[PDB]
Amino acid sequence: VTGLSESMAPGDIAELGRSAELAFRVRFEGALPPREQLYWRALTMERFDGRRWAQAPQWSGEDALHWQKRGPELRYDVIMQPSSQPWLFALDVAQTDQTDTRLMSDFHLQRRQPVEQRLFYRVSSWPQALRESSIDPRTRWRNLQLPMHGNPRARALADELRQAHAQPQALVAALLQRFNHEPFAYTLKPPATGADGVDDFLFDTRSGFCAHYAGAMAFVLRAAGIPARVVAGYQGGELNPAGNYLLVHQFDAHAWVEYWQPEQGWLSVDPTYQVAPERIEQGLEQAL
Ligand SMILES: [Cl-]
Numbered sequence: 001v002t003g004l005s006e007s008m009a010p011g012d013i014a015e016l017g018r019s020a021e022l023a024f025r026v027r028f029e030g031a032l033p034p035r036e037q038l039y040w041r042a043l044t045m046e047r048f049d050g051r052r053w054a055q056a057p058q059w060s061g062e063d064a065l066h067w068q069k070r071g072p073e074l075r076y077d078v079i080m081q082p083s084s085q086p087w088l089f090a091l092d093v094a095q096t097d098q099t100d101t102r103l104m105s106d107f108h109l110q111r112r113q114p115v116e117q118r119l120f121y122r123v124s125s126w127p128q129a130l131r132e133s134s135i136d137p138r139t140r141w142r143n144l145q146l147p148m149h150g151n152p153r154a155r156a157l158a159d160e161l162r163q164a165h166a167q168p169q170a171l172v173a174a175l176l177q178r179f180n181h182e183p184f185a186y187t188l189k190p191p192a193t194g195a196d197g198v199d200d201f202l203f204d205t206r207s208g209f210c211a212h213y214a215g216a217m218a219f220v221l222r223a224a225g226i227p228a229r230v231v232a233g234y235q236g237g238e239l240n241p242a243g244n245y246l247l248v249h250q251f252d253a254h255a256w257v258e259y260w261q262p263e264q265g266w267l268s269v270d271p272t273y274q275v276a277p278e279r280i281e282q283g284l285e286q287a288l
Contacts (some may be wrong), residue, residue: 001084002250004042004232007054010190010197010216013232014209017188017284019250022081023234024089027245029075033091035236036280037127039256039268040248041094042087042233044106048222050147051197053215053230058104066105067093067265071128080119086111089233089248091125092268105139106229107131107266131266135227143227143260151219153199158223168226168261172269175220179213179274182206186213186276188288213271214255221259228259231268236283251284 002019024040045053061067074091088094088101088109095103098121100112132139165171185207193200198219201212208216214230221228235254237246256270273280278287 001082003083003085004087004253005085006043007045007052008211008232008255009052010193010201010208010212013211013253013255014188014190016250016253017209017288021250023083023248023250023252024078024080025245025247026237027077032239032246033074035283037091038236038246039091039231039254039270040089040234040237040252041092041108041231042089043108043231044258045230045232046106046142046145048146048215048219050150050195053211053218056106056142058106058108058110061103061105061107065134066103066132067107068130068133069093069126070130071126074125074127075123076125077120077122080115080121082117083115086114088115088119088121090123091127093127093129093131094123094125096124097122105136130264132260133263133265135260135265140227140260143229144222144225146219146222151196151198153196153203154216154220155223157202158220161220162224168259171224171226172221172259175217176269176271176274178202179217179271184208184213184275186272186279186288210253210255210272213275214257217257217269217271218259221257226259226261228257231256231258235270235280238283238285 002021046056047054104110190208191205198216218228218230232255234248234252236252237248258266258268
């Protein structure tokens with residue numbers, strides 16, 4: 001069963017980029033949101049071992065210290081194909097009618113068992129929800145984790161950025177600007193990197209797919225003292241006007257970033273948008 005799994009190395013999402021299998025279908029109560037908003041969260045990956053980003057264990061996120069509803073509620077129904085994984089796909093921050101599924105501490109939906117048959121479920125999402133304005137110290141610590149060894153160039157960059165930009169939002173903007181101005185390539189056939197994979201990507205090849213960009217950005221943020229994690233899921237979808245629903249295929253698999261700061265809580269950012277805005281605005285198969 002092709003699909004997202006609990007870990008990924010840069011390159012692994014590109015392999016899904018090459019699959020046209022169906023992942024899920026979605027029908028909205030009202031108008032389809034703009035494509036730029038169609039970030040379908042599956043899970044977060046908080047552990048980086050120098051090669052792969054991976055899911056950590058979670059606890060409950062269904063409480064008011066965790067998050068606060070604000071802004072518009074988007075209501076939609078989903079039919080998911082079997083994933084053989086226990087994650088329901090939904091726009092952040094999601095609530096469902098599934099009594100065996102819980103919103104976890106990292107704002108992903110964890111089902112008690114993996115989805116091994118087609119599954120219909122109903123969702124409400126609050127994309128403007130405030131997330132963890134006060135962060136659990138364990139969550140903070142976990143999201144500053146890096147290997148001690150490896151990727152010295154990226155650590156040097158993070159140091160330089162931290163010294164130049166006191167405010168997290170400014171540092172994040174400066175990092176996004178590097179992707180925007182430098183000759184980065186967005187490709188389904190990224191060049192191989194060596195052991196210092198983040199350095200090789202940022203400073204040598206400047207070529208990758210979404211996991212390269214998301215993983216490298218999360219690395220640099222953590223090295224600069226900004227808690228950050230990779231978000232994995234899907235972005236976009238294909239409209240079926242005969243049936244009035246969106247299809248989301250495996251080629252729509254995507255990875256992005258969220259980072260934390262006091263008061264504002266977690267904010268999501270997508271470095272891919274700096275290099276391949278058409279991917280976001282048009283969809284991968286209209287771009288690549
Ligand atoms: Cl990838």
